[PDB]
Model the fold of this input.
Amino acid sequence: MTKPSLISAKILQHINSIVWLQSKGIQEPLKPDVIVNNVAYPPNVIAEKPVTNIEVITNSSMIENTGGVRQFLCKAVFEYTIVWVFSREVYKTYHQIPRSQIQDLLVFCQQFVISAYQGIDPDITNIDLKPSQVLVKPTEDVNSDVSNSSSWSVVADLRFMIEFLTSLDEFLPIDFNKIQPPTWELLDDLDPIVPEQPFTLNGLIISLNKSELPKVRADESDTYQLEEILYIPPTIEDQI
Amino acid sequence: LYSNLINVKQKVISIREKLGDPRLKSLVFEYPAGQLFRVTPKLKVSMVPKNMIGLPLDSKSNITISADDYYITDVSRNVPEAAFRTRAWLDPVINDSGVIVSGINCRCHVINDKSGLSYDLILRKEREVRV
Done:
């Protein structure tokens, strides 16, 4: 269904049991190493990137015409960036930083997000992985030790290509509450085109014709006689 | 003469250390193979600001670094030229032995020798430093 519920489930699966995310924001942390259980751990942040490549193809075999409202299959790329900052005070050389454990944590998150098909949204039809990039670039302006040497920053991206089912009926003015008012005015004094409304069958009228002897024709009015006009629920009489 | 001029320049510059300024940093070299050569004056040095660049080991790689350099202005010509081909240390510590434990590792990046009686040089910090 809707991408905000899906993205909330995606970040929940991300931080579920794999990555510990101390803060969420676009900024390398300048906090000291975090002390928990008398053990020091590096600062980290997560940047949730805006959803891109939002495309609706209507051209997949996994779209069922249920006959109520037209369904769609939507493709999206959901991009998350996790950054860990390793201070140079404790990590003197590049090779002693725990890059291996970061890669292990990254592959574990990839496996957990891929396996959780039924746990992210029921309407997910495909989840695929783009090749992840791991960078050991320096921090933005974060210095640790004497001489003002830049701290080690380990940056890992996760880009999930995900295909899921949607319908028109899933979107309501409640999810647009802080961006768009319901029932606004048209920008050029035009009328809004109202979509179709689900039609309810609250009466049926049948008018049958008794055709002439050779065969039914149904075009000329003298070749058939009106027999009766039938209202399938008797209560439709005198109502419409 | 240019011979006694460098030595008198060292003597007059040795006044700067008698005044306590924080820009003074101790520079040592390892010009002979195994032991150290120390510049006589505790000369001053400025820091040119950092720049974010790719790795000099492989430029077209994911690993990037920040190039940090130091600008040493008044350094006598009495030091051997071949000392500049060897790694240098800023604010090093010497133990009881002939080795150094801590200090800031640097390599001569660019030489300015326009003045005939003193060198002036910029030296780039190593990617991995001790302190």
